[PDB]
């Protein structure tokens, strides 16, 4: 799990104040930025790759 | 191996008496570095 | 891996790729501990925050790989999972405390030049080797950098990367985060004034943190890439799951004798 910067206001599970995560039960105010009390939404999981060569489909089943 | 298997010995390295390019770095960390 | 280099063929024969079947994607790293057992991070399989909860059937294990994306035909071994095991006290509920898991292969893998297990340490190895200042080695196919300018190059390596990092004194690990650090964790990475850098990053998680014993020439798995607050930030540290400390769990699940 790598926590990266909050992208939208009200996201949690991301870097809000500096290199500090804004945890569950908090939400990020893209101001300075503020990590606030409140139910945020976790910045969504990034998908980093996708240029894979073909593996035998016997395994893809 | 015998009882405990032959873990952590690479065939292409330790088994051929060859060192990987940055192992030394790990080794000296121990005697300071 | 951030500021690492290309691994040499067979340099980390225990490195495993956790591969998503549909859509095809690299989930995380792992390690081979025997011809049937794979060690990974619990968050790679179960992480409610991202509604991540994979089954044995959602994933494949790719072993003996150098290349991130090629299908290494007479070298890599692709295996199906028989069962998964998550540590029962794994606190995803923001701690990632006890972030460990085991995967059992449907069939045992044949070892080779590019496939061979690493060693789990004993107490005296763990006592000898886990010292602040000593260096461990991290490997993976994760991101080259925390963030980059989109569509200008690729932030993912074409080949497995390796980086050597020093273990940091706990008080310092502790003072670098606002998160509550447990006994089941340790942190590694250079100090800001230290003048070197490198870290694990997205896609490297689940992977092995290894140390080599000079006395017997053996590679031992001391950690599992668990979490960090960014990748390679100054005054920030990569956090590893403390393997020695959870070996009684491992012992209990494998039930070898
Ligand atoms: C799958 O099992 C995990 C184990 O705790 C649970 O947290 C998760 O909510 C489950 N997913 C489903 C199908 O709701």
What does the DSSP assignment read for C79-100?
Answer: EEEEEEEE-TT-BTTTT-BT--
The H or E element containing residue A28 is strand A26-29
Does C21 contact chain A (CB < 8 Å)?
Answer: yes
Nearest CA to ligand 1 atom 2: C53
Contact C52, C59 (CB under 8 A): no
Angstrom distance (rounded) from CA C109 to CA C65: 14
Q: Are strands C185-188 and C208-212 parallel, antiparallel or unpaired?
A: unpaired
Say which of C93, C96, C155 has its CB closest to residue A1: C96
Q: What atom in ligand 1 is closest to the CA of residue C53?
A: 1
Q: What separation in Å is there between the alpha carbon of C59 and the centre of ligand 1?
A: 16
CA distances from C87 to C27, C96, C103, C179, C220 (A): 19, 11, 12, 21, 21
Task: For domain C13-117+245-257, give the fold.
Answer: Thrombin, subunit H (2.40.10)
Rounded to 5 degrees, φ, ψ at C125 are -70, -55
Q: Is the link from the previous residue into C199 a cis peptide, with omega within 30 of 0?
A: no
| Chain B contact partners (≥3 CB pairs within 8 A) | C
Half-sphere exposure of C153 (CA within 13 A, CB side): 10
Say which of B7, B22, B32 has its CB closest to residue C119: B7
Within chain C, what is the greatest distance between any pair of CA atoms?
Answer: 53
C234 is an active site residue: no
**Ligand 1 binding pocket, CB closer than 6 Å:** C 46, 48, 53
The H or E element containing residue A15 is strand A14-15
Contact A6, C230 (CB under 8 A): no
Half-sphere exposure of C133 (CA within 13 A, CB side): 8
Angstrom distance (rounded) from CA C240 to CA C237: 10
Nearest CA to ligand 1 atom 5: C46
C-alpha torsion sign, points C206, A2, C10, C127: negative
Disruptive mutation site among C24, C179, C236 for chain A (greatest number of A CBs within 10 Å): C24
Domains along chain A with CATH numbers: 1-61 (2.70.10.10)
Mark yes or no for CB contact C164/B12 under 8 Å.
Answer: no
Q: What separation in Å is there between the alpha carbon of A43 and the centre of ligand 1?
A: 20
Domain residue ranges of chain C, discontinuous segments joined by +: 1-12+118-244, 13-117+245-257
Mark yes or no for CB contact C220/B8 under 8 Å.
Answer: yes
What does the DSSP assignment read for C136-157?
Answer: EEEEES--SSS---TTSS-SS-
Q: What separation in Å is there between the alpha carbon of C213 and the centre of ligand 1?
A: 40
Domain residue ranges of chain B, discontinuous segments joined by +: 1-33
* Nearest chain C CA: its distance from A58 CA (Å): 11
Token pair recorded at residue B30: 């121990």
Phi-psi map region of C179: left, alpha, beta (phi>0 left; psi -120 to 50 alpha): beta
Q: What is the CATH number of domain C1-12+118-244?
A: 2.40.10.10
Taking 3-state DSSP, the helix, strand and coil percentages for chain A, each rounded to the nearest 5, stand at 0, 30, 70
What does the DSSP assignment read for chain C?
Answer: -BS-EEPPTTSSTTEEEEEETTTTEEEEEEEE-SSSEEEE-GGGTEEGGGTEE--GGGEEEEES--BSSS--TTT-EEEEEEEEEE-TT-BTTTT-BT--EEEEESSPPPPBTTB-PPBPP-HHHHHHH--TT-EEEEEES--SSS---TTSS-SS-SB-EEEEEEBPPHHHHHHT-SS---TTEEEE---GGGT---B--TT-TT-EEEEE-TTT--EEEEEEEEEEESSS-TT--EEEEETGGGHHHHHHHH---
Closest to C228 in 3D by CA, of C216, C241, C240, C238: C238
CB contacts, 8 Å: A46 with chain C: 202
Nearest CA to ligand 1 atom 11: C53
Contact C107, C237 (CB under 8 A): no
Token pair recorded at residue C11: 């340099």
Say which of B9, B10, B22 has its CB closest to residue C164: B22
Size of interface B-C (CB pairs under 8 A): 70
Q: Closest residue of C to B21, CA-based?
A: C8
Does A7 contact chain C (CB < 8 Å)?
Answer: no
C-alpha torsion sign, points C23, C24, C26, C31: positive
CB contacts, 8 Å: B27 with chain C: 212, 214
Tell me the sheet residues that pair with C136: C165
Resolution of the model in angstroms = 2.3
Q: How was this structure determined?
A: X-ray
Task: For domain B1-33, give the fold.
Answer: Epsilon-Thrombin; Chain L (4.10.140)
């Amino acid at each position: 799990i790598t926590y990266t910067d909050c992208t939208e206001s009200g996201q949690n599970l991301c870097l809000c104040e500096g290199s500090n995560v804004c945890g569950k039960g908090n939400k990020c105010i893209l101001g300075g930025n503020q990590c606030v009390t409140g139910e945020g939404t976790p910045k969504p999981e990034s998908h980093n790759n996708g240029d894979f060569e073909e593996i035998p489909e016997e395994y893809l089943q | 191996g015998s009882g405990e298997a032959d873990c952590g010995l690479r065939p292409l390295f330790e088994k051929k008496s060859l060192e990987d390019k940055t192992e030394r770095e790990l080794l000296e960390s121990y005697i300071d570095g | 891996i951030v500021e690492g280099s290309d691994a040499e063929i067979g340099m980390s024969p225990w490195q495993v790729m956790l591969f998503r079947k549909s859509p095809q994607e690299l989930l995380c790293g792992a390690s081979l501990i025997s011809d049937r057992w794979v060690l990974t991070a619990a968050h790679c399989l179960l992480y409610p925050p991202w509604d991540k909860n994979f089954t044995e059937n959602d994933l494949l294990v790719r072993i003996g790989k150098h290349s991130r994306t090629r299908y290494e035909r007479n070298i890599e071994k692709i295996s199906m999972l028989e069962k998964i095991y998550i540590h029962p006290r794994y606190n995803w509920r923001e701690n990632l405390d006890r972030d460990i898991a085991l995967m059992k292969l449907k069939k045992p893998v044949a070892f080779s030049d590019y496939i061979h297990p690493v060693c789990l340490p004993d107490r005296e190895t763990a006592a000898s080797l886990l010292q602040a200042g000593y260096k461990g080695r991290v490997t993976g196919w994760g991101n080259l950098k925390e963030t980059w300018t989109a569509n200008v190059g690729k932030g993912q390596p074409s080949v497995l990367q390796v980086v050597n990092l020093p273990i940091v004194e706990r008080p310092v690990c502790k003072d670098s985060t606002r998160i509550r650090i447990t006994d089941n964790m340790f942190c590694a990475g250079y100090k800001p004034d230290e003048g070197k850098r490198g870290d694990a990053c997205e896609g490297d998680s689940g992977g092995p943190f290894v140390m080599k014993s000079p006395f017997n020439n053996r590679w031992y798995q001391m950690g599992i890439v668990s979490w960090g607050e960014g990748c390679d930030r100054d005054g920030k540290y990569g956090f590893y799951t403390h393997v020695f400390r959870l070996k009684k769990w491992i012992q209990k699940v494998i039930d070898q004798f």
